[PDB]
Design a protein around this ligand. Structure first.
Ligand SMILES: Cc1cc(-n2ncc(=O)[nH]c2=O)cc(C)c1Oc1ccc(O)c(C(C)C)c1
Ligand SMILES: Cc1cc(-n2ncc(=O)[nH]c2=O)cc(C)c1Oc1ccc(O)c(C(C)C)c1
Lengths: 248, 239
């Protein structure tokens, strides 16, 4: 089962660096969002039905740095830098929430039941759900839980992000064929890396590939949450980079 | 326009996984079947090459249906009727969505690119034309995996197959799938006019392919040795 060629190892170092350079620290230094913030001590109705404005405002406080790390990750890929600006824009819009969600999910902590967003803010499922994500909180927690057994490393996470980045079916793309070829290149190196890694579970490759489909739906589902957030939250709490990536 | 409920997201995830897990990888992994195999009834050489891949083609549809808990809760008997009813419908949608306008080939199973003439002469007759033309229509629909998945679930849960024991429970599932599909499409905003009417009509085109195919199959049985017919092909298509 082939292992990475030399050129593939080089692509691997490029993507791995791009990712670790934009993925600050994570255990220790992590502060918990105060337990009062977006959680009733005793839950009496299904959660996530209206946006808790206080929780929401704490999340939007760290969302600018969060989005910029995704943007800096992409800009360190020599393949992304060959695309024209309009395709760059559309691909960042398409994959932003998919990569953010992946990252948060790999920071799942089984003992506290928390995700640590940005490597700095630990949140529970209720707090993330109530502060705007609704059911997307479940999808990210659940994905986080199911990913522990995959034992992902930096390279594997980086590679998934580049697969997600290079999706040629975002609406509006001009360089559809070039983007798919880059995706295929990333995917071929990825599979070869997985062949080298030898995780001890059957059909690991297709099992891991499936997570790309899940992260796609999470992104689609969040696009609906953004709309509900737009109607329920006052405008002043939406940072301009938040609006720029998730609008339109 | 309403968007998916939380419960509709959960079905969407279920059906979409079902489909992507059983739809193997394709821009390139594909191998053009040599242009001398079905040049221009029933070319025994071309046909032989299609039945070689038909067994994997059907167990894919089978596995797709078996990853839907709604399907696995119905009685065995109904499952068998649903799957025979829809097999060729779904196979033809998958082939059609892999239509390549540059080569004017469909890619079967994501592995065997063929032209209109090969699939035609290899046994499908005019059904090849109908898959190809559906392949041309769908181009500008840009269905994603969820949309194809949902379509496939609509074809599956067709409550009018003859002999079905649980008519109303299959209709009710088909309505769950139809409501999630519309809601999903409402938020996807494709740039064709009357997108939803036009997509639903694709279902009626597909149901006809399957009907037409059931009749092509009897011609195939007349004209090709029974030995070339893999036992799963026979099991899904034969009375
Ligand atoms: C703010 C935030 C950041 C990440 N994230 N993003 C980049 C990164 O490098 N690491 C990380 O955890 C992950 C998630 C799930 C995240 O939560 C949200 C994502 C999207 C979103 O709209 C909201 C509103 C509730 C503000 C929160
Ligand atoms: C072999 C074949 C497979 C599919 N198909 N089935 C499942 C799938 O996942 N993808 C796919 O293309 C679709 C078509 C249209 C197809 O061609 C045939 C369908 C039916 C049929 O009877 C024949 C005979 C000529 C052998 C060929």
């Amino acid at each position: 089962k082939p292992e990475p060629t030399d050129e593939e190892w080089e692509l691997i170092k490029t993507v791995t660096e791009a990712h670790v350079a934009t993925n600050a620290q994570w255990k220790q230094k992590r502060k918990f969002l105060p337990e009062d913030i977006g959680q009733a001590p005793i839950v009496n109705a299904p959660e996530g039905g209206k946006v808790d404005l206080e929780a929401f405002s704490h999340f939007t406080k760290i969302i600018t740095p969060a989005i910029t790390r995704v943007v800096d990750f992409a800009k360190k890929l020599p393949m992304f830098c060959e695309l024209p600006c309009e395709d760059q824009i559309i691909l960042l819009k398409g994959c932003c929430m998919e990569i953010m969600s992946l990252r948060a999910a790999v920071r799942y902590d089984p003992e506290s039941e928390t995700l640590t967003l940005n490597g700095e803010m630990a949140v529970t499922r209720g707090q993330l759900k109530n502060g705007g994500l609704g059911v997307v909180s479940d999808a990210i927690f659940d994905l986080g839980m199911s990913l522990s057994s995959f034992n992902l490393d930096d390279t594997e996470v980086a590679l998934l992000q580049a697969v997600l980045l290079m999706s040629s079916d975002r609406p509006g793309l001009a360089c559809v064929e070039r983007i798919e070829k880059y995706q295929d290149s990333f995917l071929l190196a990825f599979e070869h890396y997985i062949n080298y890694r030898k995780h001890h579970v059957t059909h690991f490759w297709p099992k891991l590939l499936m997570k790309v489909t899940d992260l796609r739906m999470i992104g689609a589902c969040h696009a609906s949450r953004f709309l509900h957030m737009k109607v329920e939250c006052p405008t002043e709490l939406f940072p301009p980079l938040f609006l720029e990536v998730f609008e339109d």
